[PDB]
Amino acid sequence: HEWGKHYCNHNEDAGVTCSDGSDLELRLRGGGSRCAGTVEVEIQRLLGKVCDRGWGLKEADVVCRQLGCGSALKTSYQVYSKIQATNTWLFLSSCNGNETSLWDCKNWQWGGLTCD
Amino acid sequence: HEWGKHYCNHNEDAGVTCSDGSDLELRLRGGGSRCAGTVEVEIQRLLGKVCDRGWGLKEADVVCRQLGCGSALKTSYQVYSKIQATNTWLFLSSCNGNETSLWDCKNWQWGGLTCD
Amino acid sequence: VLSPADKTNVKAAWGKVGAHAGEYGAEALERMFLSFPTTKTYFPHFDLSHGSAQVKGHGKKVADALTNAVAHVDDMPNALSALSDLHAHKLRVDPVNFKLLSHCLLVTLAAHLPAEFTPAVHASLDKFLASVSTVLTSKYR
Amino acid sequence: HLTPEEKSAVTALWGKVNVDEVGGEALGRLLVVYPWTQRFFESFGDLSTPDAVMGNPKVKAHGKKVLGAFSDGLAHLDNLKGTFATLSELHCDKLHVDPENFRLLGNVLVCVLAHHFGKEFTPPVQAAYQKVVAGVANALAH
Amino acid sequence: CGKPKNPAHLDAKGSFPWQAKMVSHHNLTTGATLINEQWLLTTAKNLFLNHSENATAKDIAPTLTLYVGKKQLVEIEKVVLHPNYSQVDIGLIKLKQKVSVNERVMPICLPSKDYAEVGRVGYVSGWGRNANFKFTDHLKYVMLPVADQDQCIRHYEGSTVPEKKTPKSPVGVQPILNEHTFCAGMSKYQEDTCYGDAGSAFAVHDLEEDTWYATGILSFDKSCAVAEYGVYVKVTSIQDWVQKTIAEN
Ligand code: HEM
Ligand code: HEM
Ligand SMILES: *[C@@H]1O[C@H](CO)[C@@H](O)[C@H](O)[C@H]1NC(C)=O
Numbered sequence: 001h002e003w004g005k006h007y008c009n010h011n012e013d014a015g016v017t018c019s020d021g022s023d024l025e026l027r028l029r030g031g032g033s034r035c036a037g038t039v040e041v042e043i044q045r046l047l048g049k050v051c052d053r054g055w056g057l058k059e060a061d062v063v064c065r066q067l068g069c070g071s072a073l074k075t076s077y078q079v080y081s082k083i084q085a086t087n088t089w090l091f092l093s094s095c096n097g098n099e100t101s102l103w104d105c106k107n108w109q110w111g112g113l114t115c116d
Numbered sequence: 117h118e119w120g121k122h123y124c125n126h127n128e129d130a131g132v133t134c135s136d137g138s139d140l141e142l143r144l145r146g147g148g149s150r151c152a153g154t155v156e157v158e159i160q161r162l163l164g165k166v167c168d169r170g171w172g173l174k175e176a177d178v179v180c181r182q183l184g185c186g187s188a189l190k191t192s193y194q195v196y197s198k199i200q201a202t203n204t205w206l207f208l209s210s211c212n213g214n215e216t217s218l219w220d221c222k223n224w225q226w227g228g229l230t231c232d
Numbered sequence: 233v234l235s236p237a238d239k240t241n242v243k244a245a246w247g248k249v250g251a252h253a254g255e256y257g258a259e260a261l262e263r264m265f266l267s268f269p270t271t272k273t274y275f276p277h278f279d280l281s282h283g284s285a286q287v288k289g290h291g292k293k294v295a296d297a298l299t300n301a302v303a304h305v306d307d308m309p310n311a312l313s314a315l316s317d318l319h320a321h322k323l324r325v326d327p328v329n330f331k332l333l334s335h336c337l338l339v340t341l342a343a344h345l346p347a348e349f350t351p352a353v354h355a356s357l358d359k360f361l362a363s364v365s366t367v368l369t370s371k372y373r
Numbered sequence: 374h375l376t377p378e379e380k381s382a383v384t385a386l387w388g389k390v391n392v393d394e395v396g397g398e399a400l401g402r403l404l405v406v407y408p409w410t411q412r413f414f415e416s417f418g419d420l421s422t423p424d425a426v427m428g429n430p431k432v433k434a435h436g437k438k439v440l441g442a443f444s445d446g447l448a449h450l451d452n453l454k455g456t457f458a459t460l461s462e463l464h465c466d467k468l469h470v471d472p473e474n475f476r477l478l479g480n481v482l483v484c485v486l487a488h489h490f491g492k493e494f495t496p497p498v499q500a501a502y503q504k505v506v507a508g509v510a511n512a513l514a515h
Numbered sequence: 516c517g518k519p520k521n522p523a524h525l526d527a528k529g530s531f532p533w534q535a536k537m538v539s540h541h542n543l544t545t546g547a548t549l550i551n552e553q554w555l556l557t558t559a560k561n562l563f564l565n566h567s568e569n570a571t572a573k574d575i576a577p578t579l580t581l582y583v584g585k586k587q588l589v590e591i592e593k594v595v596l597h598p599n600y601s602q603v604d605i606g607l608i609k610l611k612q613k614v615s616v617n618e619r620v621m622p623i624c625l626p627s628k629d630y631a632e633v634g635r636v637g638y639v640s641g642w643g644r645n646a647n648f649k650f651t652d653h654l655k656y657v658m659l660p661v662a663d664q665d666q667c668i669r670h671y672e673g674s675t676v677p678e679k680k681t682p683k684s685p686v687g688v689q690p691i692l693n694e695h696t697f698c699a700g701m702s703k704y705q706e707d708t709c710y711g712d713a714g715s716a717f718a719v720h721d722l723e724e725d726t727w728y729a730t731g732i733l734s735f736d737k738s739c740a741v742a743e744y745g746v747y748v749k750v751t752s753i754q755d756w757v758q759k760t761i762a763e764n
Contacts, residue, residue, distance in 0.1 A: 259496075262496060263496045263499060266496050266497070266499070266500045267496075267499060267500050267503040268503070335480050335484075338484060339483060339484055339487045339494075339499070340487075342484050342485075342487040342488045343487040343488075343490070343491060343492070343494050344491075344492075346488050346489075346491060349488060351401065351402055351405045351406075351423045351427065352405075352423055354402060354405070354406060354484075355405055355406050355423075358406050
């Protein structure tokens with residue numbers, strides 16, 4: 001539309017992350033086994049978490065589908081605890097559930113906001 | 117305000133009651149002692165009663181402090197004797213709760229309005 | 233100002249409201265009281281409990297006043313002369329309350345007649361209620 | 374402040390709202406009822422007639438954004454003042470929207486919530502909704 | 516004369532210095548205009564508040580609190596009404612001490628030529644009521660086009676010939692209309708003055724001299740967009756008495 005004459009702010013600036021696809025890792029940590037726990041993301045040597053903004057079972061099926069586990073049932077744990085803490089987050093809007101990898105879901109954002 | 121140009125009807129006419137202060141006396145009647153009954157008022161040898169509107173233990177406390185008794189406990193009594201009828205009424209505003217006489221309460225009206 | 237189309241919209245809406253106007257007015261009074269307690273200062277001698285017949289009658293009176301105003305949309309100041317004098321000098325109701333009440337009344341309609349409360353009808357009812365409020369509060373002094 | 378009953382009622386009722394329609398409808402109602410507010414939204418093109426504003430996608434998108442802000446505020450009822458501080462600075466510095474227009478938005482928003490809920494908008498929960506819209510209006514003021 | 520800091524409903528941010536706020540002893544807000552270092556202009560109706568009109572101006576003067584600039588208090592010394600106040604609501608007020616003219620306090624000087632020509636666009640700023648009938652916290656300013664006098668007379672009184680006049684003001688109250696007045700219609704977005712903006716100047720920006728001139732003092736603020744015209748008193752018709760009063764004091 002125009003240069004500068006907008007009402008955005010510096011807490012909602014843009015950015016980009018690019019990769020060839022050989023270093024995108026997704027996993028679960030802090031649970032009974034590999035197929036349960038909190039979702040842990042790894043990209044280009046930095047590891048962070050995700051944010052509940054629509055984390056329904058239908059959207060959650062994709063994470064299980066990528067790792068070879070079955071479907072998604074609930075959002076909790078029973079066995080193990082005390083996972084590491086990182087101040088970086090990933091945001092996902094919506095996914096229809098039949099895409100085999102989380103990296104293919106529409107408009108997945110890596111970092112830039114804190115979901116308080 | 118403007119002379120003659122107002123909308124009050126003839127049921128809202130004002131009045132005044134001036135006294136030396138030695139001719140005002142209130143009693144409790146209908147109960148079992150000096151300190152239980154309906155609150156009867158004597159102002160210039162005219163009978164009367166106090167309106168329930170706005171009547172609470174905080175005002176009853178000053179009423180029973182002036183008569184020489186303790187703190188008020190209830191807004192009722194046992195009917196030891198019948199009480200005669202009267203026409204005038206005394207309307208009481210909020211009392212601060214520490215003055216030593218009902219006459220010291222701010223803006224108390226004698227007569228006029230009806231306790232319907 | 234109320235444009236002729238605006239008058240037609242107001243007339244149609246208040247025809248559609250029907251006999252439920254008294255109940256809607258009572259509900260609006262209660263809702264204004266509950267939302268903003270400060271507006272209860274002008275009803276010290278009023279039984280303001282749930283289901284009270286006093287506020288029901290008061291709401292019926294307000295609704296009848298507004299219906300009379302709609303019937304005389306072209307000569308509103310004369311229709312509300314007595315009420316204007318009552319609310320201006322006698323009771324000295326602040327202007328703010330009027331707008332408050334208007335909004336309350338409006339929401340009540342939206343709660344009960346969603347189908348007819350189109351944006352154009354919303355604008356028309358807002359303009360009419362603003363005109364009534366201005367007439368009643370004009371001589372405030 | 375909000376009593377636990379009011380908090381429960383307001384959260385439960387807000388759980389039943391839809392993002393993509395009610396906020397846009399509220400914004401369109403504000404544009405149509407108070408014309409002087411069009412000056413700020415001139416960027417959105419044609420706002421001359423009611424059907425135009427109701428039919429404008431940009432209005433619906435901005436309604437989505439303001440409703441998202443409202444949901445965030447609901448999630449931060451205790452700390453509304455700090456929750457909207459950035460938005461307060463934004464509207465105070467760059468736009469010069471008067472503090473009353475925020476309350477105007479709150480009243481139209483309450484109107485459309487009544488419009489959608491129907492009988493379910495009992496006066497007790499409307500009191501809480503009035504309190505929250507008042508809180509956000511005051512927080513955004515200055 | 517006539518140099519504001521910034522030439523420009525919309526919240527003012529450094530554009531209207533001449534404006535001044537007044538409150539009576541019973542908490543009603545009104546407006547006024549700075550005319551010189553020590554004199555103001557206001558409507559007479561803003562002086563007979565909460566008391567009978569039989570009282571003298573000496574009784575009026577100490578009961579009014581006056582703010583200028585950014586909530587800067589000033590004290591009133593004298594109040595002088597126009598001898599024919601029944602038909603022209605001009606009223607002048609004298610400050611206790613002449614103000615130090617600065618960016619937030621600066622007068623508006625008066626027309627040498629009439630500007631009330633139909634279609635002329637002027638500015639009106641005031642502390643009056645808002646859409647919710649609460650006094651505005653921040654100063655508000657609106658743009659109004661001058662309107663034909665005959666249409667205004669028809670709107671508020673029906674007919675121009677005195678014998679045939681009958682009251683038809685849509686807001687109940689009737690304004691004072693005569694040769695000493697002019698009227699203005701609503702803005703483009705249907706913005707109009709409401710309670711409390713009385714006394715505010717109708718400012719016209721003359722580009723030839725790059726100067727702001729106070730063309731009128733609002734004398735009817737009860738329109739509140741319900742009536743279609745607001746009523747002002749022409750400064751040119753009042754210039755001479757203003758000059759005489761200032762010179763005499
Ligand atoms: C659309 C706006 C309003 C309308 C049409 C309206 C109409 C009326 C009517 C018809 C009456 C009865 C007069 C009579 O019986 O002689 C009345 C009385 C009254 N109104 Fe209003 N009114 C409005 C706004 C308000 C507001 C905003 C308040 C206060 C916040 C208020 C407070 C009162 C009070 C205290 C009375 C006296 C009731 C009594 O003495 O029993 N009114 N009004
Ligand atoms: C009262 C509650 C309000 C909330 C929660 C709110 C929230 C927001 C938010 C989150 C934005 C950011 C949009 C973006 O970055 O693209 C925004 C922008 C904006 N707001 Fe508000 N706002 C409120 C009141 C108002 C009011 C009352 C007005 C005008 C009458 C207004 C006018 C605007 C405008 C013009 C923009 C910029 C739109 C653009 O140029 O793209 N806001 N608001
Ligand atoms: C007031 O009106 C009268 C009417 O006869 C006129 O003689 C007088 O000059 C007027 N005064 C002023 C100050 O305009």
